[PDB]
Design a protein around this nucleic acid. Structure first.
Ligand SMILES: [Mg+2]
Ligand SMILES: [Mg+2]
Ligand SMILES: [Mg+2]
Ligand SMILES: [Mg+2]
Ligand SMILES: [Mg+2]
Ligand SMILES: [Mg+2]
Ligand SMILES: [Mg+2]
Ligand SMILES: [Mg+2]
Ligand SMILES: [Mg+2]
Ligand SMILES: [Mg+2]
Ligand SMILES: [Mg+2]
Ligand SMILES: [Mg+2]
Ligand SMILES: [Mg+2]
Ligand SMILES: [Mg+2]
Ligand SMILES: [Mg+2]
Ligand SMILES: [Mg+2]
Ligand SMILES: [Mg+2]
Ligand SMILES: [Mg+2]
Ligand SMILES: [Mg+2]
Ligand SMILES: [Mg+2]
Ligand SMILES: [Mg+2]
Ligand SMILES: [Mg+2]
Ligand SMILES: [Mg+2]
Ligand SMILES: [Mg+2]
Ligand SMILES: [Mg+2]
Ligand SMILES: [Mg+2]
Ligand SMILES: [Mg+2]
Ligand SMILES: [Mg+2]
Ligand SMILES: [Mg+2]
Ligand SMILES: [Mg+2]
Ligand SMILES: [Mg+2]
Ligand SMILES: [Mg+2]
Ligand SMILES: [Mg+2]
Ligand SMILES: [Mg+2]
Ligand SMILES: [Mg+2]
Ligand SMILES: [Mg+2]
Ligand SMILES: [Mg+2]
Ligand SMILES: [Mg+2]
Ligand SMILES: [Mg+2]
Ligand SMILES: [Mg+2]
Ligand SMILES: [Mg+2]
Ligand SMILES: [Mg+2]
Ligand SMILES: [Mg+2]
Ligand SMILES: [Mg+2]
Ligand SMILES: [Mg+2]
Ligand SMILES: [Mg+2]
Ligand SMILES: [Mg+2]
Ligand SMILES: [Mg+2]
Ligand SMILES: [Mg+2]
Ligand SMILES: [Mg+2]
Ligand SMILES: [Mg+2]
Ligand SMILES: [Mg+2]
Ligand SMILES: [Mg+2]
Ligand SMILES: [Mg+2]
Ligand SMILES: [Mg+2]
Ligand SMILES: [Mg+2]
Ligand SMILES: [Mg+2]
Lengths: 158, 134, 259
RNA sequence: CGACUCUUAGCGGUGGAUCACUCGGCUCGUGCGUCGAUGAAGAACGCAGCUAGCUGCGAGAAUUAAUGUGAAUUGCAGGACACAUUGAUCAUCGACACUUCGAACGCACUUGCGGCCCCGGGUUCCUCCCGGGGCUACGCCUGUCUGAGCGUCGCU
RNA sequence: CCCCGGAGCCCCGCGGACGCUACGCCGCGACGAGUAGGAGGGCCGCUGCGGUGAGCCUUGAAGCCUAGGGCGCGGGCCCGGGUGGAGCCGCCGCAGGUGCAGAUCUUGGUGGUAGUAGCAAAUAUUCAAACGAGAACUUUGAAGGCCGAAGUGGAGAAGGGUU
RNA sequence: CGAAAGACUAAUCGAACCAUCUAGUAGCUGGUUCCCUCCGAAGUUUCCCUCAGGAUAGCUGGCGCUCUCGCACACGCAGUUU
RNA sequence: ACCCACCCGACCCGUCUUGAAACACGGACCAAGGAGUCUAACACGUGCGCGAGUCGGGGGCUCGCACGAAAGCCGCCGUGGCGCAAUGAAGGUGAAGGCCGGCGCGCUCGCCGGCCGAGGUGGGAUCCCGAGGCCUCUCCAGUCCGCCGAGGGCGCACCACCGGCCCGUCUCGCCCGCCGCGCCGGGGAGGUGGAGCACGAGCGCACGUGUUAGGACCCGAAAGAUGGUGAACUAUGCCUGGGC
RNA sequence: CGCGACCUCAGAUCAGACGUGGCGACCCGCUGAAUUUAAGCAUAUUAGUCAGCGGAGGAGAAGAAACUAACCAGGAUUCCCUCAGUAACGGCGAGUGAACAGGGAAGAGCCCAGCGCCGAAUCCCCGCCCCGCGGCGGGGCGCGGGACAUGUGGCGUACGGAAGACCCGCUCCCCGGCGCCGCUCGUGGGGGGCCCAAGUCCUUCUGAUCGAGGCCCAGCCCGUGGACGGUGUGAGGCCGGUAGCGGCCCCCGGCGCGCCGGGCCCGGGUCUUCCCGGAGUCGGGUUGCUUGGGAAUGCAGCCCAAAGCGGGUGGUAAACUCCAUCUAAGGCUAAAUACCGGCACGAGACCGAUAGUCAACAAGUACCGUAAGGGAAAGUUGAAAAGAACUUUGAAGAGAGAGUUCAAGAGGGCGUGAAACCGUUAAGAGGUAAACGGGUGGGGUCCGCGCAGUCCGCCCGGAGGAUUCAACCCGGCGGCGGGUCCGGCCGUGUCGGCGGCCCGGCGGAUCUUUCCCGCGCGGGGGACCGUCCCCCGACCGGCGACCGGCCGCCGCCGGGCGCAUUUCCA
């Protein structure tokens, strides 16, 4: 029964909720586990960025977010076509590619081509064998860095 | 402290480990120090006590400077019986009184081949650590 | 306490009319446990009233500035010999109270060195008093791996472990902190404010970079400064018998007019 | 004073509170994440020099082998062993072994009845008889063999 | 018409308690029933944790018992003696499965009732001996009795499971 | 199941027993654990498938605040009276 | 404080009740156990930190955690929450006024320059000014120090009242605007609905009380539902035996 | 009336394979209540929840848009934070209740049918040889069988694809083995084994010490080890361990190099010519369940039943109309995620034997019930069994002595041993049941005395006795306080240096692209402003922030002073 003034309030504890309470005593143990697993994955992908692949710049949807810009899922095909990277290869050099992205405006396209161009400049493709063929960079830019890149690769700053 | 996160430091766990210990493991638990004399000679602190070592009792009632030969090792009872360490029961019969190995000192070892190789292994590890410390 | 604790029986009440007492009683059988008393918080067997749960709100989370304020407060009173002595630490013969030292002390790799240091600095008599305190705990925590108890010793704030934290380790009483990762649980143990510490010049320099002086930001904790003071002249005895104030007070009526 | 009754205290009973212990629980976390027709889980019945129960094992039955260990096991016996030797005793466990029921499988659940191949006594393949051994569940797939049909054709 | 490092002091402004844990200390008045209920204070009490007592403890901890000595309005507490035989407490904080006379409360124990009710269905026992520490009851012998072959006899079924 | 008594269905029958849902619900019985101190009620209101209960006023406590002046120097208020 | 005596007083507790020593219930006795808990949500109070902000989660970077599943740090420090703005069902709209001078006819209406800038009344703790005393060992002069202070002011918070502004709505009215002159858009006056504005008070953490949802102070139904076990008693049918 | 193809079907103890049951914490598919709430109850709620059935895996399921949106647009699934107790549902009551965006954890994408081209270019099983053989594989060779044109394999799948011509640039990827090298993060991966510091020093307690003082050298040793346990009490150093980028030995993994055996002639752009999509499905009607989904969110049955610039979606039914957005009716896929079952560990502000699991123990045991099922009680001698030899009474159980033990006032259900209740011993009482409150008395029990308790302390006066002073100077040390702020260090407010400003850094939506570097933007300079630091002078608060001299005062030590003094004692 209500007594003199207060929010006529509806709690949702009518089902058997104590049967499905989910505690968080994991979380520290979890946080570590992720972190180990993270450091392992770095070490496996030895000079490759820990991050992942490079990802496009992309505007959010809706009037609300609109003004901001994130990393997207992957670079469109037009953006790869214009940059001149064969889509099947782009995956092999650490360039995210989605193929479901349309491309409406040319301002978002040329920006994302520029991204890939810049990436290709500051990328150090190792040759397949220690014996060096084409494409593969010099042993100078190799000895001076077989270095991983900490954090997201070429980060987007709005 | 102990930092190894697979050891135990848990009364109940250590005691259970102890009392329900298997024979070969008890051998190690039932170890006893060498006399300073042997400590000098072999480069070994202590040794797993055995059926017919010569031994002094260091503490208790039977604490004394006599050197009694070991009689048997009752690993179930965590104890060793020693030559003249005994007590007359009600009806005259002598009964070998138990002494815990660690409250005893080995003056003379019973050296077999295996005991010889053990002492060679312990002395070598001791001198490796002194070389590492230096 | 376990969920099933107390309810693993199947027990119905013999209703009224049997004399007895309307409790659920163990059902059937030819044992002692039959027609007993199940479930009730009062019964043997039974079920504790409001069995304890795991999702009691164990952890407790504190505003970050407040945490810092405490840690500044503890530091500030690690000065002040009175507050250090009152917190028990035998700091009688120590040379200077915010005790800062050479930075070879990063070097040491052996307790030998670390103890010798503490004896020259006259901080050993705290460690000595730690040994003296080592005794058996009172009661049930004895049988739950809290069997021995003792004093807290000298804190030792270092800037970098170059070997130090190995050296001071077996010396009972000592806790080692990084400067860059200070902790109020250790600087104010018991929630009690004083505590004799021992600084390393590298670390003791770094404090102002960590906490920021009054006219400079932290420069290491993004957006932070010291907490400002509410009153500046703390010694009110210096205030109250000033010229300025005693000039302006009526003369103290102090006769005692008894009945 | 008398007996009895009541009260207090001493000592003794009854009874098992209290306190002190804890090889047990309860909770939280970590890693791994593996049963079965090559017979699982579960059940049964067995097995010790003296052993009922718990445990441990399977007619090789408180265990065999192997490897590690290195003198015991021990309630009492008895023993072994040369503990300068594959070597007691534990641990591990990769080899071997694993009675009967059980999805449970020749068919039945009496522990009853069988069939079919081979072996030993029995014969001198004489089938019997006895004993041993190996097969003999249902469903389903890929093939195989034997077939069925006024099913669709061809040749005769 | 002078200075208290000296007027000698009932007032002293030159410096200030024996007193001042300022959450302290002190003075004047007034008032004081209390269920349900509310609030405050508990140097009241229980168990565990961080601190802290250079605490206590086999030269005797906890508990237990005490026509011993005291304190407190009280919750309670402290000492003496006995018993016991291994741990335990004071202070500052934190924490709670924290204080019982009742619940036809739960589990365990013990009384009065009480040496009381009671050991009354179906006719029946007696004598001698033996064994034996010991015989109303065993066994043997003798007598007197009953079941009276739809049996208190002689054999199975089921059930028991070594009787 | 009943030649019918609601009989019988393992000492249980106008719906057996066992385990679970289940710590089922209860405006109704019962109980509800230390001390001192201070204040201290109500059984009347309106509404309610309300009349052995709630709601709402009332009556209680707690926390306060804003001012007042016995610090020769007071405004306002009342279970009165004029 | 142990026992005994005597005088006076004195019914057994718990409980429900208008009323209990009751011929009202519970209670033979002792020991141990035994009932307002925890989570969530709200509100108010209080304590602390920061303050038009605040915030910490969640995540991440620092360690094998002895103490650590802590502690620290983060252009993540703010995605985001709450807060800093309302009001309308909604399309939407959205908290300023005054004064002065000029120009439109000052038309209590429309447009252009300057100044002030959150209005005013009453009461308001408190500050401020202060005539004037009141003495000093003399007659006057006379700066210094107070004590009081009649009288007069600025007036916090808060309260009451009157103005004002914003949104909804109605009534009455007269003007403005332009890429689109339109069933376009904008304003004015006067009422009236709003959990509004009128120089901000919140955010986070902690404790307390209260109220709820949860087993929810502890004990208590008759019942209800799901899935299983029984015809060894007994009910009836059938098979095969026995008996009078 | 034959023989032979095939088709559809049988039978084999035919050859070789698989499936069956279990477990069930987590997971997938069905099925599905009622207590309960609503203060009654029927819709609602409880709840797609319990029970029921099915099937799994180390995870499962999901998943590469017939998606979101309506933006300047995002771009598989899962998970967290938020959205949000919101939009919505609801006897619009009780109550219930999502999604997108945004930020994170993770991150990975693919394959068929079809349409087409390619002598079925494909697959399975036989049998002979070489290797390899405890996850039955490689290579070769067989007119050795079969599957297959009612369609196997290569290319290829919407992100387009194929075939063609010339623009370009050049040719490592995989597996079966056989070796060999570096033992490859808790700082040598995983598993096993066996190892590694320092006192039983003195004295002294004690039944026993592990306890308490002590141990000249700077502090007994060791200390990368002072976790824990054990050992006749409390142990860094007695023993096991503990610490350590410590050691050795096994085994196994994982990755590096060499050789062999095979396979494998595997691109891209540019222009042309062709190629292109899953039917009793979508969709509709419907009835029933379901959802926040409301003129139908999703799933169903039944009836109708499609199209190809189609189809689906675009959260209010319909028609017209533009836009946007996917491409359904076939399939595979790690990861962050879950885990009250299992194996193996670690920990605790938990419980400490009526608690904590039913269960600390020969517990799912005994015991009960026809059965489904129900289900206890129960820990502790002692350091050591040293568990009471022997003598004696008794038929014996039981005693009495003796002995063991530090103790049997620890005697095999034995640590401690409360209360109820009982026995006795001592004391006291006794016809109004006892018991109680207040008030005295009497007696007991102990406790404090006193064999005067006349209790102490100051100061003084006298009387005895005894050491060195005080007072004073002198020398030394230490302390305080002071102003001349005297001299110097120290720091507040102000002013001067524009002096740190570039030899002072950060911050800024201040500016400049005259600059530089990298691609109008990013980074760095360069101006500018705000903030923080050097130089000296002046004024002032001269501040407990210190030094140095000087002064005054105090105290201590030693010098002086020998006695009308200053002490001590009675
Ligand atoms: Mg990431
Ligand atoms: Mg329990
Ligand atoms: Mg205790
Ligand atoms: Mg008595
Ligand atoms: Mg008991
Ligand atoms: Mg009162
Ligand atoms: Mg009360
Ligand atoms: Mg003991
Ligand atoms: Mg607790
Ligand atoms: Mg009681
Ligand atoms: Mg009688
Ligand atoms: Mg017979
Ligand atoms: Mg019924
Ligand atoms: Mg209840
Ligand atoms: Mg009622
Ligand atoms: Mg009051
Ligand atoms: Mg009533
Ligand atoms: Mg009545
Ligand atoms: Mg009464
Ligand atoms: Mg009456
Ligand atoms: Mg009643
Ligand atoms: Mg009664
Ligand atoms: Mg109790
Ligand atoms: Mg508040
Ligand atoms: Mg309220
Ligand atoms: Mg509640
Ligand atoms: Mg109930
Ligand atoms: Mg019903
Ligand atoms: Mg299965
Ligand atoms: Mg209802
Ligand atoms: Mg109700
Ligand atoms: Mg009803
Ligand atoms: Mg529902
Ligand atoms: Mg289920
Ligand atoms: Mg899957
Ligand atoms: Mg799909
Ligand atoms: Mg999405
Ligand atoms: Mg919200
Ligand atoms: Mg629902
Ligand atoms: Mg094809
Ligand atoms: Mg130890
Ligand atoms: Mg010990
Ligand atoms: Mg050692
Ligand atoms: Mg529904
Ligand atoms: Mg629409
Ligand atoms: Mg799938
Ligand atoms: Mg027990
Ligand atoms: Mg017990
Ligand atoms: Mg128990
Ligand atoms: Mg006990
Ligand atoms: Mg006992
Ligand atoms: Mg006990
Ligand atoms: Mg004793
Ligand atoms: Mg005893
Ligand atoms: Mg006893
Ligand atoms: Mg004991
Ligand atoms: Mg008497």
């Amino acid at each position: 029964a209500p007594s003199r003034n207060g929010m006529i309030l509806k709690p949702h504890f009518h089902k058997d909720w104590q049967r499905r309470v989910a505690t968080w005593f994991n979380q520290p143990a979890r946080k570590i586990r992720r972190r180990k697993a993270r450091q392992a994955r770095a070490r496996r992908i030895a000079p490759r960025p820990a991050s992942g692949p490079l990802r496009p710049i992309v505007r959010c949807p809706t009037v609300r977010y609109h003004t901001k810009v994130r990393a997207g899922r992957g670079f469109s095909l037009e953006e790869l076509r214009v940059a001149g990277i064969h889509k099947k290869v782009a995956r092999t050099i650490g360039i995210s590619v989605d193929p479901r992205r349309r491309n409406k405006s040319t301002e978002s396209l040329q920006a994302n081509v520029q991204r890939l161009k810049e990436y290709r400049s500051k990328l150090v493709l190792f040759p397949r064998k220690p014996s060096a063929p084409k494409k593969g960079d010099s042993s100078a830019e190799e000895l001076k860095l077989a270095t991983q890149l900490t954090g997201p690769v070429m980060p987007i700053r709005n | 402290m102990k930092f190894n996160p697979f050891v135990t430091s848990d009364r109940s766990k250590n005691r259970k480990r102890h009392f329900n210990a298997p024979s070969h493991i008890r051998r190690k638990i039932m170890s006893s120090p060498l006399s300073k004399e042997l400590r000098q000679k072999y480069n070994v602190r202590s040794m797993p006590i055995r059926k017919d070592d010569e031994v002094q009792v260091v503490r208790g009632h039977y604490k004394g400077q006599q050197i009694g030969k070991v009689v048997q090792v009752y690993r179930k009872k965590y104890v060793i019986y020693i030559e003249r360490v005994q007590r007359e029961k009600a009806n005259g019969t002598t009964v070998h009184v138990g002494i815990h190995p660690s409250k005893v000192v080995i003056t003379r070892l019973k050296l077999d081949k295996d005991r010889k190789k053990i002492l060679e292994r312990k002395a070598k590890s001791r001198q490796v650590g002194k070389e590492k410390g230096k | 306490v376990s969920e099933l604790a107390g309810h693993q029986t199947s027990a119905e009440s013999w209703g009224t009319g049997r004399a007895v007492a309307r409790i659920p009683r163990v059902r059937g059988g030819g044992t002692h446990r039959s027609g007993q008393g199940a479930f009730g918080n009062m019964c043997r067997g039974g079920r504790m009233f409001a069995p304890t749960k795991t999702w009691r709100r164990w952890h407790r989370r504190v505003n970050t500035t407040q945490k810092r304020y405490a840690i500044c407060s503890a530091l500030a009173a690690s000065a002040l010999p009175a507050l250090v002595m009152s917190k028990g630490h035998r700091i009688e013969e120590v040379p200077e109270l915010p005790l800062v030292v050479e930075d070879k002390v990063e070097g040491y790799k052996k307790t030998k060195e670390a103890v010798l240091l503490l004896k020259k600095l006259k901080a050993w008599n705290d460690i000595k008093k730690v040994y003296a305190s080592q005794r058996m705990r009172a009661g049930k925590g004895k049988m739950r791996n809290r069997r021995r108890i003792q004093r807290r010793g000298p804190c030792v704030i270092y800037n970098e472990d170059n070997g130090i934290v190995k050296a001071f380790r077996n010396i009972p009483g000592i806790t080692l902190l990084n400067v860059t990762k200070l902790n109020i649980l250790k600087l104010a143990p018991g929630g009690h404010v004083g505590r004799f510490c021992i600084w390393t010049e590298s670390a003791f320099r770094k404090l102002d970079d960590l906490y920021g002086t009054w006219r400079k930001a932290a420069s290491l904790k993004s957006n932070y400064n010291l907490p400002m003071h509410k009153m500046l002249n703390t010694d009110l005895s210096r205030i109250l018998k000033s010229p300025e104030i005693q000039r302006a007070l009526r003369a103290p009526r102090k006769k005692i007019h008894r009945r």
